[PDB]
Amino acid sequence: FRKMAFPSGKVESCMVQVTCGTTTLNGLWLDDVVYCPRHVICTSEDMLNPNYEDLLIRKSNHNFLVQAGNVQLRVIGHSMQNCVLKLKVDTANPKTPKYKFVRIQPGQTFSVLACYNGSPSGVYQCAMRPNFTIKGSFLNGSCGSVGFNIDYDCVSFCYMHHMELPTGVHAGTDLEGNFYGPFVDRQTAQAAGTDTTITVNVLAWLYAAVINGDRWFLNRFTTTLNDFNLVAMKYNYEPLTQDHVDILGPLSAQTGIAVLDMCASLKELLQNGMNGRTILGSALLEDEFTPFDVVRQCS
Amino acid sequence: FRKMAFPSGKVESCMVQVTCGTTTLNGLWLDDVVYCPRHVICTSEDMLNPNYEDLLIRKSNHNFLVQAGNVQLRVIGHSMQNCVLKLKVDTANPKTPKYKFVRIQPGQTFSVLACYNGSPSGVYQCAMRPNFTIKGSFLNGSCGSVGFNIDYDCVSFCYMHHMELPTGVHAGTDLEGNFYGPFVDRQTAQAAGTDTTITVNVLAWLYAAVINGDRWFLNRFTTTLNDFNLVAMKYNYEPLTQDHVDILGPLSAQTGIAVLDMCASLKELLQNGMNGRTILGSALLEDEFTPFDVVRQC
Numbered sequence: 001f002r003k004m005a006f007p008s009g010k011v012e013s014c015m016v017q018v019t020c021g022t023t024t025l026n027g028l029w030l031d032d033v034v035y036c037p038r039h040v041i042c043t044s045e046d047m048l049n050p051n052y053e054d055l056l057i058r059k060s061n062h063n064f065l066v067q068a069g070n071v072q073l074r075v076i077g078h079s080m081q082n083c084v085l086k087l088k089v090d091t092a093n094p095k096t097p098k099y100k101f102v103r104i105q106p107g108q109t110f111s112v113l114a115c116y117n118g119s120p121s122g123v124y125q126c127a128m129r130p131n132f133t134i135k136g137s138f139l140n141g142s143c144g145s146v147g148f149n150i151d152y153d154c155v156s157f158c159y160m161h162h163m164e165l166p167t168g169v170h171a172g173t174d175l176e177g178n179f180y181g182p183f184v185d186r187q188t189a190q191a192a193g194t195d196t197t198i199t200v201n202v203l204a205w206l207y208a209a210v211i212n213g214d215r216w217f218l219n220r221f222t223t224t225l226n227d228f229n230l231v232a233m234k235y236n237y238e239p240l241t242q243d244h245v246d247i248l249g250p251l252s253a254q255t256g257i258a259v260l261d262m263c264a265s266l267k268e269l270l271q272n273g274m275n276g277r278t279i280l281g282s283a284l285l286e287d288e289f290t291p292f293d294v295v296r297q298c299s
Numbered sequence: 300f301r302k303m304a305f306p307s308g309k310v311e312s313c314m315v316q317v318t319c320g321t322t323t324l325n326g327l328w329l330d331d332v333v334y335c336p337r338h339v340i341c342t343s344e345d346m347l348n349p350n351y352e353d354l355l356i357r358k359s360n361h362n363f364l365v366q367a368g369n370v371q372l373r374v375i376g377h378s379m380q381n382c383v384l385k386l387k388v389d390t391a392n393p394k395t396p397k398y399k400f401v402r403i404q405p406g407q408t409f410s411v412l413a414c415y416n417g418s419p420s421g422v423y424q425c426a427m428r429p430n431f432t433i434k435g436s437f438l439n440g441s442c443g444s445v446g447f448n449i450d451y452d453c454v455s456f457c458y459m460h461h462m463e464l465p466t467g468v469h470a471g472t473d474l475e476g477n478f479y480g481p482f483v484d485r486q487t488a489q490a491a492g493t494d495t496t497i498t499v500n501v502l503a504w505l506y507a508a509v510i511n512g513d514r515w516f517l518n519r520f521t522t523t524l525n526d527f528n529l530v531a532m533k534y535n536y537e538p539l540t541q542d543h544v545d546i547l548g549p550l551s552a553q554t555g556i557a558v559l560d561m562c563a564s565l566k567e568l569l570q571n572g573m574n575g576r577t578i579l580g581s582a583l584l585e586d587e588f589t590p591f592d593v594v595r596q597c
């Protein structure tokens with residue numbers, strides 16, 4: 001069992017570099033449009049106190065330097081959708097995959113293709129936290145990197161990167177330019193709401209541990225859904241819904257462990273700690289695997 | 300800091316499926332050769348005690364079904380090199396990257412592109428353990444999946460998947476078909492040697508902690524390489540080689556902490572534990588980040 005990402009080839013073929021004067025970041029080239037974070041139009045001074053509509057009307061198409069590898073792409077139009085800039089270019093991307101733009105729900109997972117200067121660098125799996133941050137690995141020049149899922153040859157783009165919070169977690173938008181969470185694309189220190197643990201994902205991960213032979217945390221107790229949620233909320237875990245219980249069905253069916261029985265194990269874990277033992281080699285309870293992630297990897 | 304796979308697109312364009320009879324696995328299509336595990340030519344029953352030489356003499360070019368997607372690549376030549384089959388096909392792969400075949404050392408990390416029926420399924424980072432297994436994630440149909448590194452748009456292929464041990468770890472070959480470790484490609488339960496901790500990678504991780512301002516564990520002592528190697532073995536840690544000392548060079552230079560000073564700090568952690576303290580947010584010492592991974596990810 002590993003943290004596994006989608007193969008990144010279909011997205012790699014779409015990454016380009018976008019530059020305005022001194023400011024450079026990544027864009028996503030689909031058909032004849034390049035999508036990128038709108039703050040590419042900002043100078044350093046602009047970023048402190050931007051008026052985006054004001055700065056954009058003053059830009060000309062020839063101010064935008066778009067590079068796909070060695071080839072420059074001529075910008076022939078531009079518009080702004082929330083925090084995303086849409087650059088019309090004179091060439092269609094011949095490797096545009098079947099794709100969709102989706103806004104994901106907290107607790108869902110996606111793969112991140114970290115890019116720098118339009119060049120793909122690494123791929124890794126992230127979850128949208130309940131407080132709408134993501135725990136990513138992003139350096140200077142990573143803005144415009146995207147997150148995505150792949151479902152039978154179709155790429156669902158869900159995340160475009162904009163920001164690293166003082167706490168080292170990250171914040172960004174969907175491909176409609178709308179931030180996840182209460183953040184803004186301005187050069188200021190911003191805090192997120194208090195984070196919580198994604199309970200349904202922890203449970204999926206415990207089932208993964210059982211599937212892979214580690215059972216030490218199981219017990220003979222059970223619990224009602226409500227009494228589990230009482231303890232979970234006490235430890236800053238998200239509540240578990242009956243929808244979540246149903247989504248855990250296949251993993252319950254596979255292991256022969258009723259969902260509310262695994263809840264009783266998790267309750268004991270939260271109240272007792274792991275006593276220095278590990279689960280799937282982790283000293284901490286892991287909450288960035290969805291039930292579908294576990295089902296896909298373990299079957 | 301977290302584990303990152305390489306972007307997999309250059310390798311995805313090289314994945315094909317190879318079928319003999321009803322037996323299908325994955326192959327790697329570079330120029331006009333497809334590389335794949337030789338046990339594709341086994342029936343379910345021959346895998347118990349296979350005579351690959353005798354099994355291959357019954358085989359002809361036209362018995363091999365090679366497909367890129369649903370498109371057949373006609374096989375025009377075949378040969379066996381150790382545990383891989385090399386199938387020459389009539390079409391040179393137009394997406395062949397710059398590539399090399401390399402045999403990695405224990406401790407080295409690489410990205411694995413897990414594939415099923417020639418269809419890439421996922422990508423993740425792996426380290427070769429000192430006992431020559433990898434802690435992978437593989438299901439039925441995964442054989443022929445490859446592991447690789449990318450250095451300046453050149454793909455270094457280092458692993459082709461063959462086997463899952465009873466303990467749930469994985470074993471395979473380099474792309475010349477030579478197993479890492481004492482494993483053989485037959486349908487038998489095989490055991491790996493007892494595993495050890497990858498000392499050079501733990502040290503790289505301590506340097507990354509230092510680079511990030513987490514340096515409480517730096518002590519006032521130094522050690523000789525030989526003294527350290529002897530104590531490290533008492534804790535089931537790998538001994539350091541001269542090559543290990545040299546690849547820690549850049550990180551030592553960046554932090555101003557001599558390699559042997561860091562070894563003395565690690566030795567104190569081994570003899571005394573962490574005393575409830577963490578390093579880079581972990582109570583456990585991480586050993587699957589190489590010095591290159593620390594440089595790359597910073």
Ligand SMILES: *[C@@](O)(CO)[C@H](C[C@@H]1CCNC1=O)NC(=O)[C@H](CC(C)C)NC(=O)c1cc2c(OC)cccc2[nH]1
Pocket residue numbers: 024025037039047138139140141142143144162163164165166170184185186187188189190
């Ligand atoms: C993009 O590369 C920018 O084009 C960059 C990515 C981050 C740099 C380091 N790691 C990253 O993920 N983004 C930024 O620099 C953004 C730009 C905004 C949206 C205009 N800003 C921040 O991430 C940012 C600003 C501040 C800050 O101010 C003052 C104070 C504290 C944190 C902080 N983060």
Ligand SMILES: *[C@@](O)(CO)[C@H](C[C@@H]1CCNC1=O)NC(=O)[C@H](CC(C)C)NC(=O)c1cc2c(OC)cccc2[nH]1
Pocket residue numbers: 324338346437438439440441442443461462463464465469483484485486487488489
């Ligand atoms: C390839 O897919 C096979 O072409 C398959 C991959 C493993 C299946 C489950 N997870 C995997 O990684 N490989 C095998 O089935 C190989 C085939 C050999 C090389 C001919 N065999 C094993 O991995 C294997 C056999 C046995 C065994 O016997 C009896 C007993 C215990 C473990 C075991 N593993």
